[PDB]
Amino acid sequence: RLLRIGNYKNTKNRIIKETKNEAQAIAGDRIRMFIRFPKFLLEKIQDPKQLLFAVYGLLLHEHKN
RNA sequence: CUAGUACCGAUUGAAUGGCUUAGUGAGGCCUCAGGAUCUGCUUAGAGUCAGAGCGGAGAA
Known part of the structure; x- marks a missing residue:
């Protein structure tokens, strides 16, 4: 199951x-x-004028253990 | 499998530079012309009224 x-x-x-x-x-x-x-995580979002909210891309296989 | 190194060699792809055939050629300067305008004199208008004629300067 692990990637090699x-x-x-x-x-x-x-x-x-x-x-x-x-x-x-x-x-x-x-x-x-x-x-x-x-939608249940929405409670954790903060106003982006007061707190830094940032988004990063991933490379293809970086999700696999 | 990766790395490096060169060779051709395809499009001139797409440019930069030297030499070169043929053709064209801005601009100011010299020179042949031109004469918007301004103005002096003169017999002459009326007692500024015009006209004519002889000169000087001079832009496109």
């Missing part, structure tokens, strides 16, 4: 090279983003 990689180096840089090529929105774009968000 072999050459970490050759996998790492190969993945990055594709990702910049497949980019849909790029630096300096104005964007709206729609996130499938479980």
Whole structure:
């Protein structure tokens, strides 16, 4: 069930090279983003003028143990 | 499998520079012309009323 990689180096840089090529929105774009968000967590959101709220992308397999 | 290194070699792709055939050529300067306008003199208008004629300067 665990992911196994072999050459970490050759996998790492190969993945990055594709990702910049497949980019849909790029630096300096104005964007709206729609996130499938479980509504019960909404109680934890704070006013973004008082508290920093930030969003990060993930690379393909980074979710796998 | 990755790295490096060079060779051709495809589009002139897409540019920069030297030499070169043919053709064209801005601008000011010199020179042949032109004469919007302004103005002096003169017999002459009326007793400024005009006209004519002889000069000087001079922009496009």
